[PDB]
From Swiss-Prot:
Transmembrane segment boundaries: none
Localization annotation: Nucleus; Cytoplasm
Similarity remark: Belongs to the snRNP Sm proteins family. SmF/LSm6 subfamily.
Pfam families xref list: LSM (PF01423)
Oligomeric form and interacting partners: Belongs to the 40S cdc5-associated complex (or cwf complex), a spliceosome sub-complex reminiscent of a late-stage spliceosome composed of the U2, U5 and U6 snRNAs and at least brr2, cdc5, cwf2/prp3, cwf3/syf1, cwf4/syf3, cwf5/ecm2, spp42/cwf6, cwf7/spf27, cwf8, cwf9, cwf10, cwf11, cwf12, prp45/cwf13, cwf14, cwf15, cwf16, cwf17, cwf18, cwf19, cwf20, cwf21, cwf22, cwf23, cwf24, cwf25, cwf26, cyp7/cwf27, cwf28, cwf29/ist3, lea1, msl1, prp5/cwf1, prp10, prp12/sap130, prp17, prp22, sap61, sap62, sap114, sap145, slu7, smb1, smd1, smd3, smf1, smg1 and syf2.
PROSITE patterns: SM
Name of the protein in question: Small nuclear ribonucleoprotein F
Organism: Schizosaccharomyces pombe (strain 972 / ATCC 24843)
PANTHER family associated with the record: SMALL NUCLEAR RIBONUCLEOPROTEIN F, SMALL NUCLEAR RIBONUCLEOPROTEIN F SNRNP-F
The protein's role, per its UniProt record: Plays a role in pre-mRNA splicing as a core component of the spliceosomal U1, U2, U4 and U5 small nuclear ribonucleoproteins (snRNPs), the building blocks of the spliceosome.
GO molecular function, one term: RNA binding
Amino acid sequence: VPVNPKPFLQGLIGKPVLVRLKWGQEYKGTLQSVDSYMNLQLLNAEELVDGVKTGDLGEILIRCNNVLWVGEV
RNA sequence: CGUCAAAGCACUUUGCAAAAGCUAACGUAUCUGUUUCUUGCCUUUUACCAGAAACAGCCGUUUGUAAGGUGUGCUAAUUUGACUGUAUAGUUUUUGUAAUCUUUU
């Protein structure tokens, strides 16, 4: 039974989520809002670079160009 | 419809210039005259008959340009031209696969 990207991101909102970039980095955190262009927003995010935490930033938005991955923790 | 540029605008009165540029109604109209010839009917010439060629007038038409007139605006309206004139963050151009490092000559 089909599960489409909009409905998927409309159901992912709120829960813990990890998303990569095109440049290797992968950031975990809960999701607040999703535009029509995916174009993610995060809160309480910790940047895992090569499976290693670097800097805890907090409130975040990522431009939708760089997003490689979308899934869950 | 949109932009930009020019200009007052529409309507009107005169003046002044033009109107085969590659065969084509300046006028889907159309009349008179002069000269030179040819034929008609004729002897008074005019006035005429009905063909030609060559010239002319007249009744009109169009265009450009100049100055004006009326009505309207010159805190506007209208005309005229010109233009490579449209809106797309998700695969073929303007919302990026970029960033970065190292060796050779």
